């Protein structure tokens, strides 16, 4: 029975693989790669300029009715040339399925806004811009959403310090809240927790 191990769904794995081949054949111009995770989650890696065609197909196609945009976020990987990774999660209610579309960009490369396909993309792209600095070209209203007014820098980048650079306090001389360089009574204590022994041999990388 193996009660401590999650059961696997080969039927769903095969269905997702077949649909991945289907979409890859239908859109060869932009689809760069297709993967299926072992917990049955389809993933498509496309060219950054194929966002609008791929999303429009996945929304309007009869066999792919992904009418709902579940989420839209970014992942920062500084070791890559195109550090920012834009991730779209789509939900198909007609077929009761979920799909993921992943593209890449850097600081100075705009990404076409998908507000014309999904309306939630408006606030999702505003948050992505506010937190990472990724610019979306045709956005009806692109501005900060979460950070303070006049905040400098994008907090969610990996190179942004955890406590930031400035702090706020009330200064009685000027009778207003003032911003001053950060200074902590107790410094955040960094812990080195990585064990020096490899845990999962299945993910071992070549020594190169």
The residue (of 1 and 195) whose beta carbon lies closer to other proteins is 195
The residue (of 25 and 159) whose beta carbon lies closer to other proteins is 159
Distance CA 74, CA 109 (A): 14
Structure tokens at 64: 């792919």
The minimum distance between CB 65 and other proteins, in angstroms, equals 32
The minimum distance between CB 31 and other proteins, in angstroms, equals 20
Name the site residues for other proteins (rule: CB under 8 A): 78-81, 107-110, 133, 135, 137, 142-144, 148-150, 152-154, 157-159, 161-165, 171, 173-174, 176-199, 201, 204-207
The residue (of 96 and 194) whose beta carbon lies closer to other proteins is 194
- Work out the number of other CB atoms within 10 angstroms of the CB of residue 10: 8
The residue (of 5 and 191) whose beta carbon lies closer to other proteins is 191
The minimum distance between CB 133 and other proteins, in angstroms, equals 7
The residue (of 46 and 99) whose beta carbon lies closer to other proteins is 46
Q: For residue 141, give every residue at least 6 positions away whose Cβ sits within 8 Å of its Cβ, in sequence order, or none.
A: 122, 126
Q: For residue 127, give every residue at least 6 positions away whose Cβ sits within 8 Å of its Cβ, in sequence order, or none.
A: 145, 146
Buried b (16+ CB within 10 A) or exposed e, 118-146: beebbebbbbbbbbbbbbbeebeebeeee
The minimum distance between CB 92 and other proteins, in angstroms, equals 31
Structure tokens at 1: 């029975």
The minimum distance between CB 58 and other proteins, in angstroms, equals 24
Distance CA 95, CA 12 (A): 12
């Amino acid at each position: 029975t193996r009660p401590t191990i999650r059961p696997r769904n080969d039927v769903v794995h095969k269905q997702l693989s077949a649909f991945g081949q289907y979409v890859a054949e239908i859109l060869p111009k932009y689809v760069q790669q297709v993967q299926v995770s072992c917990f049955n989650e389809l993933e498509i890696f496309i060219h950054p300029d194929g966002v609008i065609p791929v999303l429009t197909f996945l929304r309007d196609h009869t066999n792919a009715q992904f009418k709902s945009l579940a989420d839209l976020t970014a992942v920062d990987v500084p070791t890559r040339q195109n550090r920012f990774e834009i991730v779209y999660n789509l939900l198909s209610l007609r077929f009761n399925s979920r799909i993921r579309v992943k593209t890449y960009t850097d600081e100075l490369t705009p990404i076409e806004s998908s507000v014309t396909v999904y309306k939630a993309a408006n606030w999702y792209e505003r948050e992505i811009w506010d937190m990472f600095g990724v610019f979306f070209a045709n956005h009806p209203d692109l501005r900060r959403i979460l950070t303070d007014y006049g905040f400098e820098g994008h907090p969610f980048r990996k190179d942004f310090p955890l406590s930031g650079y400035v702090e706020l306090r009330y200064d009685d001389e000027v009778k207003r809240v003032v911003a001053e360089p950060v200074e902590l009574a107790q410094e955040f204590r960094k812990f080195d927790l990585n064990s020096p022994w490899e845990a999962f041999p299945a993910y071992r990388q070549p020594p190169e």
